[PDB]
Amino acid sequence: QLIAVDEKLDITTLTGVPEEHIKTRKVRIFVPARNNMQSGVNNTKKWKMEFDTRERWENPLMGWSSTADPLSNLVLTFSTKEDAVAFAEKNGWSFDVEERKVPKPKSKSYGANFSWNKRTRVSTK
């Protein structure tokens, strides 16, 4: 009732993806960086998978942005790094993993602004 087969998962032959969109692609597994224009951090909570950028050219009519790859807008969301790595592996995609960047904790002291002898004393407020 159970096969108990030892082999890594591979579903490339079942997904219907063309041959040249499997071996030549390079997905990036990363936590997106915070938009430095804003202080919110709610967009740096999950892991993202994105594909490598391909050619975009100008349409001779309308000058619009034309593309020839179907994976230019495909972005996946994952809870953990391991989930993204497993999904990339079982789909036969070569991947690059970037470790999550966390802002290190810092020491803040409002009283350090009005310092008696240190350089941290502010000239205005």
Partner: protein
């Protein structure tokens, strides 16, 4: 609350909680979790092996008799080891109530067909197979129902591109319609709309 806020119904909430406890007690072999939402919707999470028993009990029991299968579909969550969750929506005319049953599967594990419990499931399981690639065992005739003949892939998967891989046109040299790789005159514009400054504190996750 105020007239812009949807009112609550505690009586229906209690009734659904009691019936969820009842069903969970009767079938401890398959039931994994029971939930009741704030808008009075009852969900029962079961093991995949219990699809036929749980559905048969809900259809045939005197106190349940959910005689109508409202809808059957799948949801794709790539981050889970079991990629797909199967959702059954049932309606009981005798007691004027609705129930939801959820299970799970992956790309390679078949799910038992429920066409013997509900005849309506025949086309729903075909649609699930066509859109997600979930195989249903002992189906009368499982085949594509929505996509074109010879279409490769399952479009409703999250990793399937929106515009697909091939496009159609008429070729005069061969005097027939041919398929060629997609090439957009204007690429679909991806919009990053999700904002920081999290909106709903009640759903905040532990920072692990």
């Amino acid at each position: 609350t105020r007239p812009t806020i949807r009112p609550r119904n505690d009586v229906v909430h209690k009734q659904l909680s009691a019936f969820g406890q009842y069903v969970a007690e009767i079938l401890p072999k398959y039931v994994q979790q029971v939930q009741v939402s704030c808008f009075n919707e009852l969900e029962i999470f079961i093991h995949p092996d219990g699809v036929i028993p749980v559905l048969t009990f809900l259809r045939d029991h005197t106190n349940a008799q959910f005689k109508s299968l409202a809808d059957l579909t799948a949801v794709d969550v790539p981050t889970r080891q079991n990629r797909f969750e199967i959702v059954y929506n049932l309606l009981s005319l005798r007691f004027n109530s609705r129930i939801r049953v959820k299970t799970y599967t992956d790309e390679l594990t078949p799910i038992e067909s429920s066409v013997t419990v509900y005849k309506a499931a025949n086309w729903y399981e075909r649609e699930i197979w066509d859109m997600f690639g979930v195989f249903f065992a002992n189906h009368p005739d499982l085949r594509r129902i929505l996509t074109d003949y010879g279409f490769e892939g399952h479009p409703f998967r999250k990793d399937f591109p929106l515009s697909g891989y091939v496009e159609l046109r008429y070729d005069d040299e061969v005097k027939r319609v041919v398929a060629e790789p997609v090439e957009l005159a204007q690429e679909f514009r991806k919009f990053d709309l999700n904002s920081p400054w999290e909106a709903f504190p009640a759903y905040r996750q532990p920072p692990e």
